[PDB]
């Protein structure tokens, strides 16, 4: 069924599963027309599909052309997301195909379910957790590749950089969600924290700086502090 705090360690067993986040698929700006009405201009979006065990990210870029001459665009983004996740699954070797797929938003259930009809033994699951994958686009290199594209384009990353070489999935995923939680809550601050020290650099093949172990601890501590600060400010606690 649904994924929550009870069945949380299931993400890290050896059953291949993916997360699908669609929040960044249909992205717009809002502006005023010459006649003063309101009008939306769309920009390149991205499907965020992620293997929480291995860090493998399947970042499907969604070009603005896909909207050209289309109605009920927000509804359509769901079906497109589902189309493109199903095409990803079909392109993978049977043994690489996932046993399950977790949509971070319950609206995607029907579209994906329809689209995955040919894989009846692939379970589509909602989640009760409140994952922060909408802030995927606060990661500089992901936003850059999205915003540069001239055509539908698939790009592969490992969103854990090389961390697994020294830590576990569970921990990797926790770091990942924490860093994204902060970037969501106050991006300017979260980003200050990650880049303050010009001497800790981001490898060309990596998304995050090459912190030593000790430095990761500092950083998690600073990220945690930021997130508590922002909540007190939100509710006057």
């Amino acid at each position: 069924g649904a994924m929550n705090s009870s069945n949380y360690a299931e993400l890290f067993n050896n059953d291949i599963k993916l997360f699908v986040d669609d929040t960044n698929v249909y992205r717009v700006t809002v502006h005023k027309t010459f006649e003063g009405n309101v009008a939306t201009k769309a920009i390149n979006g991205c499907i965020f599909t992620l293997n929480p065990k291995t860090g493998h990210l399947f970042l499907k870029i969604i070009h603005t052309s896909v909207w050209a001459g289309q109605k009920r665009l927000s509804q359509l983004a769901k079906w497109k997301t589902a189309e493109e996740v199903s095409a990803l699954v079909r392109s993978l070797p049977k043994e690489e195909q996932p046993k399950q797929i977790i949509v971070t938003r319950k609206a995607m259930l029907d579209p994906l379910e329809v689209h995955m009809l040919d894989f009846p033994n692939i379970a589509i699951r909602p989640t009760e957790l409140r994952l922060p994958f909408s802030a995927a686009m606060s990661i500089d290199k992901l936003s850059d590749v999205v915003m540069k594209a001239t055509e539908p384009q698939m790009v592969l990353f490992n969103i854990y950089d090389d961390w697994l070489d020294r830590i576990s999935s569970y921990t990797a995923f926790s770091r990942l969600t924490l860093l994204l939680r902060a970037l969501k809550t106050n991006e300017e601050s979260a980003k200050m924290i990650l880049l303050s020290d010009p001497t800790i650099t981001i490898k060309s093949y990596h998304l995050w700086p090459s912190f030593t172990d000790e430095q990761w601890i500092t950083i998690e501590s600073q990220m945690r502090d930021l997130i508590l600060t922002e909540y007190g400010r939100k509710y006057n606690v």
Binding site: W79, A82, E83, D110, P111, V114, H115, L117
Partner: protein, 300 residues
Amino acid sequence: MNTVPFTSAPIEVTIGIDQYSFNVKENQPFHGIKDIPIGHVHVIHFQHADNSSMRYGYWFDCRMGNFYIQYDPKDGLYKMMEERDGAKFENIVHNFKERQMMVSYPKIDEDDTWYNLTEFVQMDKIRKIVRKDENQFSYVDSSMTTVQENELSDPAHSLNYTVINFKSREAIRPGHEMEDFLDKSYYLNTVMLQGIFKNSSNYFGELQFAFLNAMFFGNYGSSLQWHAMIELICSSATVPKHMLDKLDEILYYQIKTLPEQYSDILLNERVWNICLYSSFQKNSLHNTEKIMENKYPELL
């Protein structure tokens, strides 16, 4: 006018015929129902005074034979049986009448209700759902399951309704995933109307059969089937105008006939809010909308 005699009434029971029904007391001398309109299907059903669980009955059509009712004490229920001896049957029928131990099918001539409920119900179609082809009449009860339910146990006792699944390959043409699923016209018109049911009138017959089975037996699979058949039409952007208008009439009479205190299990909140207010056919069930609002404003 046809008659259905009863051998005997050993046990206290509430007997129903079509939408009528009568209390009969243990070893009351009851011997049958007379003046039954030749022309439609009928259904005679039972609820024992001792087990309000398991209501049960038999669908039939007098033009197919002479049927009577006999209590079987091994199985403990009223069984429908057919007499093959033409002469021997009229003899029991005329004696009980002249002893007047029979109740008259009590039809007001203004009332078109049973026909409106059974307009499209044919026996031949019924016996392809309650397969038991050594008998010309069909037995249904509260606890019988359908074929879709068996999928998600004993197949002899199956209700072989037509299987409708909105999230199936059948219903969803590859490439038209979003289209076919927001707009079930394909599924309705080509798969189900032209392919499986052949015409509108069979479709309706099954829909109406489903309803009556749920109403008279609280057959929970039958309720589900009826709402699925409604749902498919109401989720179809392109429907023949004759079917819409007939559907508005068919439901109207269904809502009208339902016991008022059962509106909670037999009416699926989602499907009806979709038909009447959300779906393509919101504007097209004027009569069903209106009865629904004035009778069951709560559920909406």
